[PDB]
Amino acid sequence: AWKGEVLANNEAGQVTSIIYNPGDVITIVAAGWASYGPTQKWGPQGDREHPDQGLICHDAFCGALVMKIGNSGTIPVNTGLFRWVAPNNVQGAITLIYNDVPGTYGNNSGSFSVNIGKDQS
Amino acid sequence: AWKGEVLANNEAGQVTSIIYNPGDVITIVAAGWASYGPTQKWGPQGDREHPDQGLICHDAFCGALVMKIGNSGTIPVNTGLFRWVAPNNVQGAITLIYNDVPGTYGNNSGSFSVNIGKDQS
Amino acid sequence: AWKGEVLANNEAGQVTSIIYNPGDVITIVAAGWASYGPTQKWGPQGDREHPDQGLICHDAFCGALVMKIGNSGTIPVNTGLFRWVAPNNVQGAITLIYNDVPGTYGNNSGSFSVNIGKDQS
Amino acid sequence: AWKGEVLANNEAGQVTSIIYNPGDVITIVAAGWASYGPTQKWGPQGDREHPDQGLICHDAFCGALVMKIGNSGTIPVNTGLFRWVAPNNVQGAITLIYNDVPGTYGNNSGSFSVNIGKDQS
Numbered sequence: 041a042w043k044g045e046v047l048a049n050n051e052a053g054q055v056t057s058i059i060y061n062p063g064d065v066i067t068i069v070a071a072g073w074a075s076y077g078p079t080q081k082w083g084p085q086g087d088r089e090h091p092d093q094g095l096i097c098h099d100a101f102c103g104a105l106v107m108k109i110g111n112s113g114t115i116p117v118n119t120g121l122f123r124w125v126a127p128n129n130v131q132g133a134i135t136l137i138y139n140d141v142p143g144t145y146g147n148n149s150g151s152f153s154v155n156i157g158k159d160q161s
Numbered sequence: 162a163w164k165g166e167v168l169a170n171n172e173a174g175q176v177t178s179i180i181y182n183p184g185d186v187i188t189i190v191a192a193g194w195a196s197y198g199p200t201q202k203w204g205p206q207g208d209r210e211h212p213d214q215g216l217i218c219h220d221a222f223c224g225a226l227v228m229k230i231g232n233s234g235t236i237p238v239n240t241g242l243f244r245w246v247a248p249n250n251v252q253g254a255i256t257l258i259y260n261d262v263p264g265t266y267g268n269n270s271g272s273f274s275v276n277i278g279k280d281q282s
Numbered sequence: 283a284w285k286g287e288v289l290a291n292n293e294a295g296q297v298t299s300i301i302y303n304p305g306d307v308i309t310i311v312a313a314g315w316a317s318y319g320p321t322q323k324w325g326p327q328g329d330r331e332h333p334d335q336g337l338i339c340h341d342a343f344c345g346a347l348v349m350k351i352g353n354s355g356t357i358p359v360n361t362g363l364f365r366w367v368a369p370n371n372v373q374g375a376i377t378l379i380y381n382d383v384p385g386t387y388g389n390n391s392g393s394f395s396v397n398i399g400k401d402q403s
Numbered sequence: 404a405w406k407g408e409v410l411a412n413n414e415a416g417q418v419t420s421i422i423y424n425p426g427d428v429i430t431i432v433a434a435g436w437a438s439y440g441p442t443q444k445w446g447p448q449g450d451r452e453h454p455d456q457g458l459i460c461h462d463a464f465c466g467a468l469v470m471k472i473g474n475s476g477t478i479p480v481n482t483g484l485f486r487w488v489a490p491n492n493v494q495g496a497i498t499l500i501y502n503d504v505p506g507t508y509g510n511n512s513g514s515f516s517v518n519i520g521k522d523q524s
């Protein structure tokens with residue numbers, strides 16, 4: 041299992057110790073407060089009122105937590121995943137990333153605290 | 162394991178099928194959007210800018226998800242709990258509740274989707 | 283989870299730290315060598331060639347591992363149980379016992395090493 | 404998780420659906436009765452009184468259950484493994500095999516019923 045923080049201003053994302061293998065069942069819980077610029081802060085589901093101006097993940101709001109598994113495209117995590125199985129042929133290290141527009145991470149602030157574990161299967 | 166919705170306007174709370182027993186390890190993931198009145202909505206951590214005007218749980222924001230276990234006081238759930246063990250002598254059915262001021266639930270809207278499972282121990 | 287030894291000559295049985303609660307899923311693995319009298323030894327499934335002359339559990343061979351849950355009757359364990367759920371209304375502390383005829387445990391020898399854990403549910 | 408039978412006379416072994424990956428925790432429970440030739444039968448720990456005359460696994464008795472993981476050497480399973488982690492660099496499909504001398508499986512009989520699951524980690 042892995043526990044750590046994902047900084048909102050980390051454009052490259054946070055590589056975890058979790059390697060997702062075919063058949064794996066995982067659970068993720070994410071908490072905390074972060075911003076993509078404004079003085080306010082939002083939770084792991086991001087800002088439901090903000091337009092998508094070229095986010096790294098178009099299936100989650102700006103300011104949401106998302107992930108990549110190996111060289112997959114971005115996958116929404118939001119508040120977390122409960123006993124979740126990845127799509128076919130998706131495998132590899134899990135990287136957690138704050139959802140923002142590439143090149144605009146410099147003014148981000150805060151972080152999410154995240155736990156990831158493999159479930160019995 | 163239990164999956165279900167918790168309505169923001171349900172003052173009594175949602176009784177789950179989960180009975181927390183001594184030694185149990187549990188994981189909860191909560192997602193979704195709800196409101197304690199305003200036209201906006203907030204996630205399971207609630208509204209970090211709103212004052213506490215007599216919330217059922219003073220350790221979480223207005224609009225956050227909280228719970229009771231048996232006849233315990235309110236315990237913050239927020240976005241969830243990862244492989245969590247309850248305090249000493251806390252046991253019984255888990256009831257999930259939206260955090261608002263008693264008598265003011267009538268104008269609430271939305272709900273959280275919540276999963277609860279017992280972990281290996 | 284619980285790990286310990288169950289002596290063949292312990293007529294009262296070995297009380298474990300496991301309390302089986304309704305809904306619980308458990309796994310048990312038992313190993314080792316024991317005897318109900320003879321110089322030979324048998325594994326946790328006992329002696330398949332020996333008649334039942336008044337065993338505490340008539341659903342397992344003499345020399346097998348069995349258990350009681352709370353005040354239940356004896357239940358066969360043998361080599362173990364995989365993600366097992368108890369019958370309706372069966373609950374309480376798990377006691378492990380060597381299957382022999384009451385009053386004849388004094389000449390028994392050896393023991394089984396046993397692990398018990400609760401599974402995710 | 405995988406459940407199936409391992410025939411005593413299957414020299415090649417029974418390939419399971421389980422792929423053991425680095426970091427995996429697994430539990431195995433094996434039960435039943437089998438023989439390497441004689442009219443008697445023995446459990447998954449095999450025959451503790453029989454000499455090793457060139458067994459595929461020298462760390463378990465003749466008639467015991469053993470396994471290979473990928474291209475590893477034989478590893479004793481016996482009655483099972485509880486929340487077990489493989490040695491460094493051992494990975495791949497789990498094959499279950501009855502422990503006997505190569506070329507002598509033709510007169511074997513019976514089988515073991517085996518469950519294998521991955522545990523939370």
Ligand SMILES: *C(=O)c1ccc(O[C@@H]2O[C@H](CO)[C@H](O)[C@H](O)[C@H]2O)cc1
Nearest residue numbers: 076077078093102140141144145147
């Ligand atoms: C209008 O209400 C508004 C527009 C942008 C904004 O913040 C920027 O959002 C960008 C992503 O859409 C990017 O993250 C910039 O760094 C932010 O300043 C707030 C409000």
Ligand SMILES: *C(=O)c1ccc(O[C@@H]2O[C@H](CO)[C@H](O)[C@H](O)[C@H]2O)cc1
Nearest residue numbers: 197198199214223261262265266268
């Ligand atoms: C301040 O501008 C403000 C005050 C109240 C409010 O909504 C109410 O909040 C109450 C709890 O504090 C309760 O939930 C009421 O039903 C809401 O109308 C928003 C903003």
Ligand SMILES: *C(=O)c1ccc(O[C@@H]2O[C@H](CO)[C@H](O)[C@H](O)[C@H]2O)cc1
Nearest residue numbers: 318319320335344382383386387389
């Ligand atoms: C005959 O083959 C035979 C009969 C009894 C025996 O051992 C006794 O078995 C009893 C249970 O049936 C009890 O455990 C006694 O303590 C044993 O001596 C071995 C062989």
Ligand SMILES: *C(=O)c1ccc(O[C@@H]2O[C@H](CO)[C@H](O)[C@H](O)[C@H]2O)cc1
Nearest residue numbers: 439440441454456465503504507510
């Ligand atoms: C001695 O009494 C004795 C010798 C062999 C035997 O069975 C054979 O065991 C071999 C492995 O050691 C192999 O499995 C043969 O197929 C068996 O016939 C029983 C007793």
Ligand SMILES: [Ca+2]
Nearest residue numbers: 076077144145
């Ligand atoms: Ca930004």
Ligand SMILES: [Ca+2]
Nearest residue numbers: 197198265266
């Ligand atoms: Ca309200």
Ligand SMILES: [Ca+2]
Nearest residue numbers: 318319386387
């Ligand atoms: Ca005896």
Ligand SMILES: [Ca+2]
Nearest residue numbers: 439440507508
């Ligand atoms: Ca043979």
